[PDB]
């Protein structure tokens, strides 16, 4: 059968309970009680949470519980620590010697601050531009929460064309990062006053220029 | 010393197969199923199917019927996942993962039934139709009190690319971003350094560049 259905997200505050929800069909989650839930850290393997429905491996914390009503099933954490935070994935046997996860639950837990990315733009280096290719290079960090949007103009017009942005990736002290290239030609890089990269964090807007000299 | 060890990353082209392997360790392998799951990057977990090291019996998800070819070992403990006619959206993170056979027996046992307790650490098959490159390294020329320099590692194939500074002395002020993937199907990346000023007409700074796919490895000096 098909993927099971949870939450995009939730998020608590440390030392509260939250629960994440797992539904299926009446031919799954509604017919045996096999649904086993792991807990996922960045780079790291999934690990067995809850299995039967509500039972614990040894060694997992008594904060995390199971439970289930009609098609869905439910994981239960109490007393939110920051490590807690994570993607949450049930899975179920699905009849037919078939199993099935659920789409998977970030789980947040909030009160860590809010800060604004720095951000570094350099121009194409005199080496490239001798080379006959030009690369502007945006360079984003430390900004939480995760998500950042990067528009570039030349002079005030819009560019979207040459743009590449990688998705933030968390760094060692828990902010995120991200970067952007704009592609140019060199005859494009010499010909406007300057171009400009222009990046978005919650509403708020930090802006780096360079300019050809 | 229980664990499930997967062999090495895997760069494939479109149309070809992928054999993908898992040594267990530790435990009675003909106990447990072997499941394997694979997760795109940024994605969820999916399961793909699995194999009982009994009988070789397998069973997988209709979508991968016809492509995935799951064998087993039993002498030397090792389960194996065959994907074939590959394609770009099979690119991800491929598992092992054991799961009991049975839900109790004679012998006492932890009888996790169907919670996979243990994993491998995971297999990057990376499917790509572009060609093994080696990187064009730029320096990134310094320009309140710190500067930031950096260097500008462009269009390689495959992952990885390893970077330091003046042959790993420099890790102060260091941050590396993680590559991005250009519509060439070629990745980038750049290193930064954040360095105070006054040091600029004095220390040198040299990124090292290490591609080992290419034999590409380039020490670039940056100066102002």
């Known amino acids: 059968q098909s993927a099971l259905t949870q939450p995009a997200s939730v998020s608590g505050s440390p030392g509260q309970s939250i629960t994440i929800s797992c539904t299926g069909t009446?031919?799954?989650?509604?017919?045996?009680?096999?649904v086993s839930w792991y807990q996922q850290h960045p780079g790291k393997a999934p690990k067995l949470m809850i299995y039967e429905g509500s039972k614990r491996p040894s060694g997992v914390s008594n904060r995390f519980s199971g439970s289930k009503s009609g098609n869905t099933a439910s994981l239960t954490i109490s007393g939110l620590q920051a490590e807690d935070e994570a993607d949450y994935y049930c899975?179920?046997?699905?009849?037919?010697?078939?199993?099935?996860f659920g789409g998977g639950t970030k789980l947040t837990v909030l009160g860590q601050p809010k800060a604004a990315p720095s951000v570094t733009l350099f121009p194409p280096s005199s080496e490239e531009l001798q080379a006959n290719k030009a690369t502007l290079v945006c360079l984003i960090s430390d900004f939480y929460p995760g998500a950042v949007t990067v528009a570039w103009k030349a002079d005030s017009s819009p560019v979207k064309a040459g743009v590449e942005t990688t998705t933030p990736s968390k760094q060692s002290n828990n902010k995120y990062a991200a970067s952007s290239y704009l592609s140019l030609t060199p005859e494009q890089w010499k010909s406007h006053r300057s171009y400009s990269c222009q990046v978005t964090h919650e509403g708020s807007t930090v802006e780096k220029t360079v300019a050809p000299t | 010393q229980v664990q499930l060890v997967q062999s090495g990353a895997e760069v494939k082209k479109p149309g070809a197969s992928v054999k993908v392997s898992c040594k267990a360790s530790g435990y009675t392998f003909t106990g447990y199923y072997m499941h394997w799951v694979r997760q795109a990057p940024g994605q969820g977990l999916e399961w793909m199917g699995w194999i009982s090291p009994v009988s070789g019996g397998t069973n997988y998800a209709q979508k991968f019927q016809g492509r995935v070819t799951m064998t087993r070992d039993t002498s030397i403990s090792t389960a194996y996942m065959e994907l074939s006619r590959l394609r770009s959206d099979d690119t991800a993170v491929y598992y092992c993962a054991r799961a009991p056979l049975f839900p109790t027996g004679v012998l006492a046992g932890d009888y996790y039934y169907y919670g996979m307790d243990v994993w491998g650490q995971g297999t990057t098959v990376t499917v790509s139709s572009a060609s093994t490159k080696g990187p064009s390294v730029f320096p990134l020329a310094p320009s309140g009190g710190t500067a930031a320099l950096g260097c500008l590692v462009k269009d390689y194939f495959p992952e990885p690319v390893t970077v330091s500074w003046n042959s790993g002395a420099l890790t102060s002020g260091v941050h590396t971003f993680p590559a991005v993937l250009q519509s060439s199907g070629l990745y980038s990346l750049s290193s930064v350094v954040t360095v105070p000023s006054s040091s600029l007409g004095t220390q040198t700074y040299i990124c090292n560049v290490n591609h080992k796919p290419s034999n590409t490895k380039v020490d670039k000096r940056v100066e102002p």
């Open positions: 899975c179920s046997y699905a009849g037919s010697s078939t199993l099935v």
């Open positions: 009446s031919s799954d989650v509604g017919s045996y009680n096999l």
